[PDB]
Curated annotation (Swiss-Prot):
It is found in: Cytoplasm, Cytosol; Membrane. It is linked to Leukodystrophy, hypomyelinating, 15: An autosomal recessive disorder characterized by hypomyelinating leukodystrophy with thinning of the corpus callosum. Clinical features include motor and cognitive impairment appearing in the first or second decade of life, dystonia, ataxia, spasticity, and dysphagia. Most patients develop severe optic atrophy, and some have hearing loss. The lineage of its organism: Eukaryota, Metazoa, Chordata, Craniata, Vertebrata. The WHEP-TRS domains are involved in RNA binding. The modification N6-acetyllysine is found at K40. Homodimer. Part of the aminoacyl-tRNA synthetase multienzyme complex, also know as multisynthetase complex (MSC), that is composed of the tRNA ligases for Arg (RARS1), Asp (DARS1), Gln (QARS1), Ile (IARS1), Leu (LARS1), Lys (KARS1), Met (MARS1) the bifunctional ligase for Glu and Pro (EPRS1) and the auxiliary subunits AIMP1/p43, AIMP2/p38 and EEF1E1/p18. Forms a linear complex that contains MARS1, EEF1E1, EPRS1 and AIMP2 that is at the core of the multisubunit complex. Interacts with TARS3. Interacts with DUS2L. Component of the GAIT complex which is composed of EPRS1, RPL13A and GAPDH. The chain holds residues 749 to 805 of 1512 of the full protein. It comes from Homo sapiens (Human). This is Bifunctional glutamate/proline--tRNA ligase. The gene is EPRS1. Residues 1-57 form the WHEP-TRS domain.
């Protein structure tokens, strides 16, 4: 199901935004953003769809 992969990248995406809102150090934002990037890369493998905006349906 493509929806399952949708939730995985969406879950990290939000964690990065939350930490930055918490004024956390660059280490928390950089590491967390790197995590979401790995999820986005897998989505790209199918047809370059990457993290679609508007969160999961």
């Amino acid at each position: 199901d493509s929806l399952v992969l949708y939730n995985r990248v969406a879950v990290q995406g939000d964690v990065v935004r939350e930490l930055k809102a918490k004024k956390a150090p660059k280490e928390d934002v950089d590491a967390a953003v790197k995590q979401l990037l790995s999820l986005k890369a897998e989505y790209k493998e199918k047809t370059g769809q990457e993290y679609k905006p508007g969160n999961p349906p």
